Amino acid sequence: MLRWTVHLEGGPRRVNHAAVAVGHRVYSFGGYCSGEDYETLRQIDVHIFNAVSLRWTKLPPVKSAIRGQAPVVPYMRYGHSTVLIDDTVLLWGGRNDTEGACNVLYAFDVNTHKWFTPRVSGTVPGARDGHSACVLGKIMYIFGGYEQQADCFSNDIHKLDTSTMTWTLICTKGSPARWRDFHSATMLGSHMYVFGGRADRFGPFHSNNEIYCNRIRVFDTRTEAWLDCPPTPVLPEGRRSHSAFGYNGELYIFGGYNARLNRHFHDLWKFNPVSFTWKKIEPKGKGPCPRRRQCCCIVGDKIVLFGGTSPSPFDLIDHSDLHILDFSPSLKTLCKLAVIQYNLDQSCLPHDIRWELNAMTTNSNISRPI
C-alpha cells in the first residue's frame, strides 16, 4: 500500500511551473519563484528529474540556430500548461510580470530538445493563465483559465487537432462548467474530469464573490457535451491549485489552497468514475507539507510531486523539494526505508543496493536553502 517513499531537496525552486513525464524522466518548464526576475525578457527554463537516479539536471540556454535570428524558445513564464504527445511537448499560455499577452503555441522535442512554433489555424484561444490542458490521441483540450485581454474567467473548451494544427472553439452541449482558473482537467478514457478552481459565484468577472469549486464536472469528448452527473455522498473541500492525475482508471487530487478558508492542503482524494464516488486516501509516511501549485507527474506506479508554495514556518515560501508517492511499494523499497530509518550500517550491503540507498538520500544541486 501507498506510501511517501522519497523526500529530496536541492531541486528547482518553482511554483506555477508545468511538467510532463517522459518515461522515467520528468521535464519541468518555467514557473515562478519569489525574488527572481519575471519582468525582463528571459528564456524559459527546462529542468529534468531522473526518477531512477533521483537526480535533477538543467538544460543549457537555447542558442541561435542561424546567425542574426533570435533563439527559438518561449520566454520565461508561469501559469502555462504542458502536455506530451508522442515525442513532443506542447506548451501553451501562461504569462510573466511584464510582456503582456502570448497565445503562441510552442512545441518541444523531448529527444532533440529543439523548440519550434508550429503554424496554427482556426480560432486561437486568447492568452490566459491557470487554464487546464489534457490530451486524447492527437487532440489537446484547453479549458478555463483567466483571459488577459477579455479580463475574465473562461469556461470555453478550445481543442487543438495537432494532426492539422487547427484550433476549434467547441460548441458544447449540456450545462458548462463554471468559468474558473487554477482548476484541473484529467482525461479518463474519453471523458475530461474538471475539478476545483477559483471562480465567481455569479458570473465570469471578479466581483468580491470568490468561491472554490468542488462539484466535479465531466465533458464527453465523443459527443462534446457536458454531462449531468449524480451527486456524491462525500467530496473534497473546494480548492484551487491542487494537482490532479489519473492512475489505474481513477482520478486523484492532491493539495491546493482555499482562500475563503485561507487553508493550504496536503490531502489526497480518489474519484472513481464508474461508481462516481469520492474517497479520502491516507498514504503511509510523512509526505509533503500543505502547499499549492506543485506539479505531479506519473512514472509507472509512482507519483513525482515537486515545487509549490506554502505558508512560511505575505510570508509564503516557494519549494525546491520533491516527494515520491509509491502506490505499490516493493519489499525492497520497504526495507530500504527501514534501513535508513533505523540508521543501520550499510557497508555490508551489495553495491547495487547501496547505490539505491545513496540515490534516495542525496539532494540535487540546483538550489540551496533559502
Place this chain on the structure above:
Amino acid sequence: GSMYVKLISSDGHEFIVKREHALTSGTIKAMLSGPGQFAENETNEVNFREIPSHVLSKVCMYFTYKVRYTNSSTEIPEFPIAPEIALELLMAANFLDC
C-alpha cells in the same frame, strides 16, 4: 501449474505457499518457468541455500500481504520490519526481486 509451490530455506525449513503469491518475486517466477520446468520434469519447488528461515518466513508474509492489499484503498496496517532483520530482509528482497 500447481496451486502451491515449496520454498526451502538454507536451514531446511519448507515453506508451502500459493504459486500466485510466490510470483510476487520476479526471481521465483523465473525459476518456476526455468528450462525444462514442464510436464513431469516440473519440480514446483525452489531451494534457497542462502536465505535462512527467519528471513524467508517474513518474505512469504510479504507475498500474502502484497496480494491481499494490491488495489486496496482503505487504511491497513503497515508491513512490520524489525531492526534486527532489516539488512537481511533487504538483501533477500533484492535477490528475489520483490
Place this chain on the structure above:
Amino acid sequence: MDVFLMIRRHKTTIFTDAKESSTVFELKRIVEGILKRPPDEQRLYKDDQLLDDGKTLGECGFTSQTARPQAPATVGLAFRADDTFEALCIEPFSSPP
C-alpha cells in the same frame, strides 16, 4: 472475514488463507491436498487446544483482526503415526543477530 494462517508441523509451514466461517475440516482438506494425508490422519491445534472438525475458524478463536496477512496466526499440525498420533512439535525458525 478472511484469516491468514501458517499451518506448521516439524519444519513444514503452509501459508494459506480461509474465511472465519470455514471449518477446521476444510482446513484439513487443504492440508490433505498439499501433504497427502487425509483429515482423519490429522490433528490441528490453536496453541495447545485441539480443534474439532465441525467448528468454524471463528468459533476456534481465529479472527480476521488477529490473523492478518503480514502477521498470520499459527495452526499446529500433528499426523497419525501408527496406532497413535505424533506429539505436536513445531521447530522454531532461525535467529537473526
Place this chain on the structure above:
Amino acid sequence: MQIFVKTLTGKTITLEVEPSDTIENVKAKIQDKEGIPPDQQRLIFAGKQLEDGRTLSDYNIQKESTLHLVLRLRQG
C-alpha cells in the same frame, strides 16, 4: 479621511487618502505600504471593479470604507 483595503486572505491595509484621488493613486499608495506593483492589483467595491481613471468620489467611497483587493496569482 481614511479607507481600508483588505485581501480575501485577511491582510488589512489602512490608507490616508483624499476623496479626489484616482484609483491609480490608491494603487500607488498600496505599493508604498506593501510593495505590490499597481499592475498586480485589482480593486473592487460593492461588487464593482474600479477603473484607474475614476476617483474615489466617482465610486461613492465614503469614510471607513473597505475596498476588496485581488492580486495576480503568480504562486497559484
